[model samples]
Target: GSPNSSPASGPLPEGWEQAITPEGEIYYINHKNKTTSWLDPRLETR
Candidate 1:
């Protein structure tokens, strides 16, 4: 759930998911909103 971490793949915990871009950037995901950005934590509200 932090920078430089491997892009999550395969099975994940409930409500958690992952997506990979063509350039290999990673996006951490949540079920409710569909995605939680892995690139920045400062922008997160809670």
Candidate 2:
């Protein structure tokens, strides 16, 4: 509910959500594809 925000890059793609680590690092979680990565999907060309 709270603490959900986008990074400096931009808003994440659809089906992707924002999650933070214990150190307060932001990452992206893709519920649609069932994957998680430190990189944003929007940044991917393919």
Candidate 3:
């Protein structure tokens, strides 16, 4: 299936905190206290 294809009738995969964007360059936020790490590379510094 295409990466942009949305599943029918079901929740997102486990550990998925949220989706930041729905564009071709889709980004997924992980369900962690340090969620920034998954969304931002610079956050790993802190």
Candidate 4:
């Protein structure tokens, strides 16, 4: 789902999903759109 859209935007585009590796590396996977980005851990630091 797009961060700019509401949950009603229907299921996220095919292959668009979030995953966290055993090492805690977060990722946004969207093979169909060839989109990917790392979830910077610093964003959660206060």
Candidate whose lDDT is highest:
2
Compute the lDDT of residue 3 as modeled in candidate 3.
50
Clashes by residue pair, model 4: none
Per-residue lDDT value at 12 in model 3: 55
**Which structure is stronger by TM-score: 1 or 3?**
1
Number of clashing residue pairs in every model?
0, 0, 0, 0
lDDT of 2 by residue, 1-46 (tens): 2344445446566788788867888877778878877773565555
Put down candidate 1 lDDT per residue, 1-46, tens digits, no spaces: 3442433323455765666767887776677677666743333344
TM-score per candidate, chains pooled: 0.35, 0.42, 0.26, 0.36
Q: Which of candidates 3 and 4 reaches a greater lDDT?
A: 4
Order by TM-score, highest first: 2, 4, 1, 3
lDDT preference between candidates 1 and 3, better one: 1
> Distance from true position, residue 1, model 3, in Å?
13
Candidate 4 wrong stretches, greater than 4 Å: 1-11, 33-35, 39-46
Instruction: Compose the digit string of candidate 4's lDDT tens values, residues 1-46.
Output: 4575554443445566667657787776667777666653222345
Q: Least lDDT summed over 10 consecutive residues: which range in candidate 3?
A: 36-45
Best by TM-score: 2
Error of 1 at 33 (Å): 3.2
Better of 2 and 4 by TM-score: 2
TM-score for candidate 4, please give it: 0.36
Query: What is the TM-score (0 to 1) of candidate 2?
Result: 0.42
Indicate the residue-level lDDT of 46 in model 1: 47
